């Protein structure tokens, strides 16, 4: 299992397919959905 | 018909397209007003992946539908 496993699903249902990018974003943010959205949107840390 | 393209951050843009418009053309229109290349335009309709070769009517996308413009960049 994963600490952000349920989080990935929440993102997927909203409009995400790649759980990999979702995990990477969640990992970079430390566990934040909205912040992760900006992470992917910017393509990492601007 | 009028559609609503809402990004991940929250930015929502209005787009004027027809039911016979291809998803690919949609991305081309978004790029012209947003400056975002179709390459990063991973348009996902609440989980439903929108294939570029398909049309808006293909996915039963009605008017006032909210499409999610997911910018999939290589980073993170």
From Swiss-Prot, chain A:
Post-translational modification: Deubiquitinated by OTUD4 which stabilizes UBL7 expression.
Domain (UBA): residue spans on this chain: 2-43
Superkingdom as given in the UniProt entry: Eukaryota
Induction: By type I interferon. Down-regulated by phorbol myristate acetate (PMA) in bone marrow stroma cells.
Tissue: Ubiquitous. Highly expressed in heart, skeletal muscle, testis, thyroid and adrenal gland.
Function field: Interferon-stimulated protein that positively regulates RNA virus-triggered innate immune signaling. Mechanistically, promotes 'Lys-27'-linked polyubiquitination of MAVS through TRIM21 leading to enhanced the IFN signaling pathway.
Subunit comment: Binds ubiquitin. Interacts with MAVS; this interaction enhances TRIM21-dependent 'Lys-27'-linked polyubiquitination of MAVS.
Protein name: Ubiquitin-like protein 7
UniProt organism field: Homo sapiens (Human)
Gene designation per UniProt: UBL7
């Amino acid at each position: 299992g994963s600490q952000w496993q349920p989080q990935l699903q929440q993102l997927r249902d909203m409009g995400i397919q790649d759980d990999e990018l979702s995990l990477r974003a969640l990992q970079a943010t430390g566990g934040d959905i909205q912040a992760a959205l900006e992470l992917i949107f910017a393509g990492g840390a601007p | 018909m009028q559609i609503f393209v809402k990004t991940l951050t929250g930015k929502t843009i209005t787009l004027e397209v027809e039911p016979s418009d291809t998803i690919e053309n949609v991305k081309a229109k978004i790029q012209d007003k947003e400056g975002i290349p179709p390459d990063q335009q991973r348009l996902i309709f609440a989980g439903k992946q929108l294939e570029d070769g398909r049309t808006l009517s293909d996915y039963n996308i009605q008017k006032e539908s909210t499409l999610h413009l997911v910018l999939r960049l290589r980073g993170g």
